[PDB]
UniProtKB/Swiss-Prot annotation, chain A:
Regions that span the bilayer: none
Residue numbers of the full-length protein present here: 2061 to 2109 of 2442
Subcellular localization, as worded in the UniProt entry: Cytoplasm; Nucleus
Domain notes: The KIX domain mediates binding to HIV-1 Tat.
Protein name, as recorded: CREB-binding protein
PTM sites of type Phosphoserine: 4, 17, 20
Disease: Chromosomal aberrations involving CREBBP may be a cause of acute myeloid leukemias. Translocation t(8;16)(p11;p13) with KAT6A; translocation t(11;16)(q23;p13.3) with KMT2A/MLL1; translocation t(10;16)(q22;p13) with KAT6B. KAT6A-CREBBP may induce leukemia by inhibiting RUNX1-mediated transcription. Rubinstein-Taybi syndrome 1: A disorder characterized by craniofacial abnormalities, postnatal growth deficiency, broad thumbs, broad big toes, intellectual disability and a propensity for development of malignancies.
Assembly and binders: Found in a complex containing NCOA2; NCOA3; IKKA; IKKB and IKBKG. Probably part of a complex with HIF1A and EP300. Interacts with GATA1; the interaction results in acetylation and enhancement of transcriptional activity of GATA1. Interacts with MAF and ZCCHC12. Interacts with DAXX; the interaction is dependent on CBP sumoylation and results in suppression of the transcriptional activity via recruitment of HDAC2 to DAXX. Interacts with phosphorylated CREB1. Interacts with CITED4 (C-terminal region). Interacts (via the TAZ-type 1 domain) with HIF1A. (Microbial infection) Interacts with HTLV-1 Tax, p30II and HBZ.
Function text: Acetylates histones, giving a specific tag for transcriptional activation. Mediates acetylation of histone H3 at 'Lys-18' and 'Lys-27' (H3K18ac and H3K27ac, respectively). Also acetylates non-histone proteins, like DDX21, FBL, IRF2, MAFG, NCOA3, POLR1E/PAF53 and FOXO1. Binds specifically to phosphorylated CREB and enhances its transcriptional activity toward cAMP-responsive genes. Acts as a coactivator of ALX1. Acts as a circadian transcriptional coactivator which enhances the activity of the circadian transcriptional activators: NPAS2-BMAL1 and CLOCK-BMAL1 heterodimers.
PTM remark: Methylation of the KIX domain by CARM1 blocks association with CREB. This results in the blockade of CREB signaling, and in activation of apoptotic response.
Curated annotation (Swiss-Prot), chain B:
Whole-protein coverage range: 1045 to 1086 of 1424
Post-translational modifications reported in the UniProt record: Acetylated by CREBBP. Acetylation occurs in the RID domain, and disrupts the interaction with nuclear receptors and regulates its function. Methylated by CARM1.
Cellular localisation: Cytoplasm; Nucleus
Annotated coiled-coil segments of the chain: none
Signal peptide: none
Superkingdom as given in the UniProt entry: Eukaryota
Motif (LXXLL motif 3): 15-19
Subunit composition and interactions: Present in a complex containing NCOA2, IKKA, IKKB, IKBKG and the histone acetyltransferase protein CREBBP. Found in a complex containing NCOA3, AR and MAK. Interacts with ATAD2; the interaction is enhanced by estradiol. Interacts with CARM1. Interacts with CASP8AP2. Interacts with CSNK1D. Interacts with DDX5. Interacts with ESR. Interacts with ESRRB; mediates the interaction between ESRRB and RNA polymerase II complexes and allows NCOA3 corecruitment to ESRRB, KLF4, NANOG, and SOX2 enhancer regions to trigger ESRRB-dependent gene activation involved in self-renewal and pluripotency.
Function: Nuclear receptor coactivator that directly binds nuclear receptors and stimulates the transcriptional activities in a hormone-dependent fashion. Plays a central role in creating a multisubunit coactivator complex, which probably acts via remodeling of chromatin. Involved in the coactivation of different nuclear receptors, such as for steroids (GR and ER), retinoids (RARs and RXRs), thyroid hormone (TRs), vitamin D3 (VDR) and prostanoids (PPARs). Displays histone acetyltransferase activity. Also involved in the coactivation of the NF-kappa-B pathway via its interaction with the NFKB1 subunit.
Other notes: NCOA3 is frequently amplified or overexpressed in breast and ovarian cancers.
Domain remarks: Contains three Leu-Xaa-Xaa-Leu-Leu (LXXLL) motifs. Motifs 1 and 2 are essential for the association with nuclear receptors, and constitute the RID domain (Receptor-interacting domain).
Record family assignment: Belongs to the SRC/p160 nuclear receptor coactivator family.
Tissues in which the UniProt entry reports expression: Widely expressed. High expression in heart, skeletal muscle, pancreas and placenta. Low expression in brain, and very low in lung, liver and kidney.
Protein name listed in UniProt: Nuclear receptor coactivator 3
Name of the gene: NCOA3
Length: 50, 44
């Protein structure tokens, strides 16, 4: 039932992170932990929504 | 109680609004590093 705020915390950290390049590294960290989520990465709507 | 791509994306979705004004390539850098297609072989 639903998911803990932990995942969202780290995840949101990426989209919420600054415009710095180092922040991007934080993304790979989350994805590395969430494989089933890696799928959505394929669409990368975020990148196509800039 | 293990899978994601739901709660996180749900909330982060709105926050993504900033990503659209952060850096296009910025998010494309880590992407390629992982491999759009390669990320498809994360099954069983």
């Amino acid at each position: 039932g639903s998911i803990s705020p932990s995942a969202l915390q780290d995840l949101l950290r990426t989209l919420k992170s600054p415009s710095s390049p180092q922040q991007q590294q934080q993304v790979l960290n989350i994805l590395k932990s969430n494989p089933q989520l890696m799928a959505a990465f394929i669409k990368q709507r975020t990148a196509k929504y800039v | 109680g293990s899978e994601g791509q739901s709660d996180e994306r749900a909330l982060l979705d709105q926050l993504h609004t900033l990503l659209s004004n952060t850096d296009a390539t910025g998010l494309e850098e880590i992407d390629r590093a992982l491999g759009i297609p390669e990320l498809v072989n994360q099954g069983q």
